[PDB]
Amino acid sequence: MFSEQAAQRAHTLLSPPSANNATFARVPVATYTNSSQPFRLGERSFSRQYAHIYATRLIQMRPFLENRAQQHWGSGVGVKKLCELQPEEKCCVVGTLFKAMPLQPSILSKYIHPDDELVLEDELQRIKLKGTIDVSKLVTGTVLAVFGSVRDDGKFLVEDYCFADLAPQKPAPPLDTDRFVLLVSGLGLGGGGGESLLGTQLLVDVVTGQLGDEGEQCSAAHVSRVILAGNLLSHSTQSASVEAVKMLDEILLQLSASVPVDVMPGEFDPTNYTLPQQPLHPCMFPLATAYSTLQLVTNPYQATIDGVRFLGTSGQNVSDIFRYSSMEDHLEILEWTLRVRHISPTAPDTLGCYPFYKTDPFIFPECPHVYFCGNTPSFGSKIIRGPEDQTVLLVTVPDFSATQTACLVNLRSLACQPISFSGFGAEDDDL
Amino acid sequence: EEAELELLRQFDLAWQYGPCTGITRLQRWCRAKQMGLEPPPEVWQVLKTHPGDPRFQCSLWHLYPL
Amino acid sequence: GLLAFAKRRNCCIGCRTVLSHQGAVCEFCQPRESELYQKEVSHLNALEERFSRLWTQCQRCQGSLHEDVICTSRDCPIFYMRKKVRKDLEDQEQLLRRFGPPGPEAW
Amino acid sequence: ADQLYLENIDEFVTDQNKIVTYKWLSYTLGVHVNQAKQMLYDYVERKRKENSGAQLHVTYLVSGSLIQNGHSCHKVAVVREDKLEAVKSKLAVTASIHVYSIQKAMLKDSGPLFNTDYDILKSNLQNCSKFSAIQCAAAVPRA
Ligand code: SF4
Ligand SMILES: [Zn+2]
């Protein structure tokens, strides 16, 4: 990929001065299209209630689950509404989960408890559930189909159940010369060390073209874009924040000089709290708004970068699922989120969102080629396949303040390589 | 009138068009038409032969501090 | 009676001086506007977090997640504490539209 | 020619008792970055061949590929003067070697090497792509 090509030449720099030194040029970004328009909210009227969201979620997700239960259990179909069930008869039900957990805090670290019930709910009534089903892997808000019978105590006995699955995916055109994309998250400007300072300096010095030989300068010239994904100012306590936007403005100036940059709000960043987070206001960045290479977006970010389509968050859905479930692997939680056809199924019950009423926008309408996450504690990447011809690369971006690691994504081979930065510390090997 | 005020009160409580006590009446009529559940072409034909009257173009409980 | 015949005079967010035009900042208190935007968006952020914890608690006290809430229980603190945050949010959202929009929306 | 920057470095280092990175010595003398690294290597080679016992400390940079557990990572490190060859032998592929800094009296960690670059950036803010090896085209002040 990158470090293979970075040694492909001769080395000139352990030498006395010369007449000329080589220069290069940044590769063109001749196609780009932002398609994150359902997350940019222009009107923003509150004063509705959260019942309009669940109803449109069920009404939109129902035909997918009917069409999958047909070909997953046989076209001798027995799909039936929750009220028209007769005692001890084999049928299929399509509904919404609700997990009834105590230890979840009310108004007046994991939170799973050894006893907690699942309830299948439709628009008119509910029913309890027991049998062969996982009690702690599933969360409230998933829509699914299920197979079984109504027993004598009013409960329901489950044999097997199925999720919605992956959406269709059109193929991408192949590329001629490999272009790279760099992904960073969580610089933590405001607190978090001094080795993080030299790490941030060495990272911007490599990507801008100040560091290393003609190998590194030829290979960093091919990096086409830069994406910064959330949690730019890590905060120690709210009640500091004014002096940090000055330094963030300086860093975005030093990056806006050479590359195009995309900046996203995070868990602590001066924006709203609900989930389609709106872009940062330009009045906090005097210096960096001189150039038209800096762009400010928000949370759920879609794009079409050179044919390859991207979609990502700053890691607020994945940690929310991590709170109220039993899965630990963040790459697994990201793939599970992909499997139920919903970016954030736990919303709104433990993760706040705007009260939409026309259409729920967190249902996947297509399949992305790349799908990344936000502030995960360690690097990971994987390739997964669909039932049809659908392949997806899954990346979890590490957190720069502890690991000092970023990710390079190739746009022609579609692979991801880590990059790590480490200056020497107070290290003396004679003690 | 007095027969048109029960048709709208019957459209407002049918559960197969949605859970609607936060929005207008014509917005819920067009929401169901987009998804095309089965809006009937009579709850439209009284919301056109009237102006902006608050006892036609409003949900049943548009008072009521809920 | 008289309360309807308002004039709705705008005021500077920094030093409280009534003046003609709709801009939020005063001409003497301009070099300090990034800090005055920083201040009060951490208030909108904390009102947003209080709207959502309350209006979904009624859904769990009611039983259902798919139908409307009707409970005007005068002995519940939940009622009329869920009514004032709508207006706090209504007011604090409109104070930040004094500042322009952070981008376009018709693209 | 040579005596110009040789005497400039000999008064910056040993008289004013300062810490000279390559970016400071390229913002002082108005030089390209790679030529500044070559200048520093010239000075250290001359004064280390002359005497062998100077009050001179160096710090280098080593970059290149590695495999920890299967995966190919790319490790970049700013290294002292004792531990260079072991770090060079741990790596798989080598991709960049030059010089980073010289000193008079030995430091304890990588503290002031950020203070120097930060302060010389602080006053020199309208140019950072001026001596950069990569010159993009669409980034010119417009808005
Ligand atoms: S207002 Fe209070 S009592 Fe009424 S449903 Fe809400 S939480 Fe329950
Ligand atoms: Zn003022």
Residue numbers in the entry:
A (entry chain B): 1 to 108, 124 to 254, 271 to 462
B (entry chain D): 42 to 107
C (entry chain A): 1001 to 1107
D (entry chain C): 2 to 144
Reported in the publication:
We show that this complex exists in alternative conformations where key interactions regulating the holoenzyme activity are lost. The local resolution map of the Pol δ holoenzyme showed reduced resolution of the PCNA component, particularly for the two unbound protomers, suggesting conformational heterogeneity in the complex. Such heterogeneity was especially evident in the particle dataset from the sample fast-frozen immediately after mixing of the components, while it was significantly less prominent when the sample was separated by gel filtration prior to freezing, suggesting that the complex conformation may stabilize overtime. In agreement, 3D classification of the first dataset identified different holoenzyme conformers in which the orientation of the PCNA ring plane varies in a range up to ~20°. The PCNA tilting also modulates the distance between a loop on the polymerase thumb domain and a loop on the PCNA front face. The contact between the two loops is visible in the lowest PCNA tilt conformer (Class 1, 4.3 Å resolution), which is the most populated (65%). However, the density at this contact is weak suggesting that the two loops interact in multiple orientations. Mutation of the highly conserved D41 residue on the PCNA loop or K931A on the thumb loop reduced the activity of Pol δ and severely compromised its processivity. We propose that dynamic interactions among PCNA loops and both the thumb and the CTD of p125 may keep PCNA in a position that is competent for DNA polymerization.
Three DNA polymerases (Pols), α, δ, and ε replicate the genomic DNA in eukaryotes, with the latter two possessing the proofreading exonuclease activity required for high fidelity DNA synthesis. PCNA encircles the duplex DNA and tethers Pol δ to the DNA enhancing its processivity from few nucleotides to hundreds of nucleotides per DNA binding event. Mammalian Pol δ consists of a catalytic subunit and three regulatory subunits. The catalytic subunit (p125) harbours the polymerase and exonuclease activities, and a metal-binding C-terminal domain (CTD).
